[PDB]
Amino acid sequence: MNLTELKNTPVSELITLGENMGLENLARMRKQDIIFAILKQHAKSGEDIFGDGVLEILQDGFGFLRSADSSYLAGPDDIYVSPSQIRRFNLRTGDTISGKIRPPKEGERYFALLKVNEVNFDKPENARNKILFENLTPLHANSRLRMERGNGSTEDLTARVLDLASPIGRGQRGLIVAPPKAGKTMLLQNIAQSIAYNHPDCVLMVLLID
């Protein structure tokens, strides 16, 4: 069954289900190894298994499928995807795939996909005739984004000052030049939570490096 719910759950719940599923010596190793072994024994029983993730293609064309919670780690949780899915199913790099998964047979370390059920929150059928990103003609920042919470929060003054100094917009290209000890990290988290609260339709994610 779906591995995301057992992936985002904390380690305690995973280990407790580990003891109650019949394997009690699966605590002293990595989270990826724990989930790999638990799902291995679970699929060995012969039950329905569901998977999801984001794919990527190596140099040889054979691809991997990583998970967002694992921070795209090259652990056993990844799923093998063949170039044939790309060649006929017409799936590009990084397409979010959710659907059936196959327990790998002997000599196969990583899982495989049986069939695809959802691609980029859309049906896999109409994803074939999808316009490319670079083929779209761009324009300037037509839309305007407001960073004010509107509830009079105790920290809304920072967002209001940011709006007054430099309004932000959709599809804009902006930089925040700052020396160290500038308080930038928490103002980025503040604008992130502001756009999450004000705009529940647009997708939000934050990239952390080193």
Place this chain on the structure above:
Amino acid sequence: TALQQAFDTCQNNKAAWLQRKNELAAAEQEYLRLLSGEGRNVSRLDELRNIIEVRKWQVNQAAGRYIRSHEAVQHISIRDRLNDFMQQHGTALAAALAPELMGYSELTAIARNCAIQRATDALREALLSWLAKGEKINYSAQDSDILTTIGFRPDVASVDDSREKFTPAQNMIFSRKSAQLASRQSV
């Protein structure tokens, strides 16, 4: 009289390519008949393959030279019509485009190719004067039926056998397959 015999040879190799397609289709229907049965032996399967690829290369080149013969006969007919109809009534064409004509006649190479460019644009304008105009037209008056039977657009099978083309090394290896095919036919 050369156009008539060229047209006759065009239908000759056209019919040759048609019968090659027929024997090819016989090869694949026999192949599918044997496949639908019990395939105990693979040597027959292997030779059926060998023959179907060599015959499809042969029909590919058959469509190829049929196509080039069709263009050859079309252009020879067009140039014969141009030559003799201008023999009949070239004075009006001469009087119409005189400037670049005298530019060509008694001047040097740069002047001649500039005159060619000038006549090129002038005749493009002349052609588009009546090309966009809506008038009913007939086939080549000398050989209308002869041109209708051959057809301007070739058969869809011509581009079916022209869509796929093998590499020159692959072309010569199919040629040697045809050679050994004739060799085993001699057996």
Place this chain on the structure above:
Amino acid sequence: ERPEEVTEMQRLVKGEVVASTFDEPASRHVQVAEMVIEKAKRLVEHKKDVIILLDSITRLARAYNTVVPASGKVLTGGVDANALHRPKRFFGAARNVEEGGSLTIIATALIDTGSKMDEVIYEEFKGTGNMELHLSRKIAEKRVFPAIDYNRSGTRKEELLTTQEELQKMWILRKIIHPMGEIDAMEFLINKLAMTKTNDDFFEMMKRS
């Protein structure tokens, strides 16, 4: 070769197999081999398919070396240079008749047995055959068999045996698998091919996996 293996050969295959052993002298091996090859060529003369198996080229080469008289000129290593033509008599019969039938030979070779005189016969027999198969000791140490070193294996004008487009297909596969190691290649090939029934399905799942 030891009688136990040749008798296992006799009892396993339905067809009749000839036998020879160290009890039989070297001249006996030479003469039985030349009757065998002459009978094979007589049989293929009647437009019939004949297959010969040789195990091995080194054993017969040693036998012909022992039985040859001294001609006064000796190739380096204490062997008669002319005598080397006689194993080629036992190997030159390999030819396909276009008018009907064909004679084929499949021969094994032995090297690195502590004998200095084994690798050079392989070197001078390298150009004799149109296809060759390498066996290495590192795979034997790896304990998994067959130790097929197909990465360096090659055939001359093998196109006549397969189709055209599918020939380029396994050649695509060949040069894709060339850069990687010789070992992991063979394990994953045999692993993918093990639980299946026919090689055609292997061909489609090379377009599926």
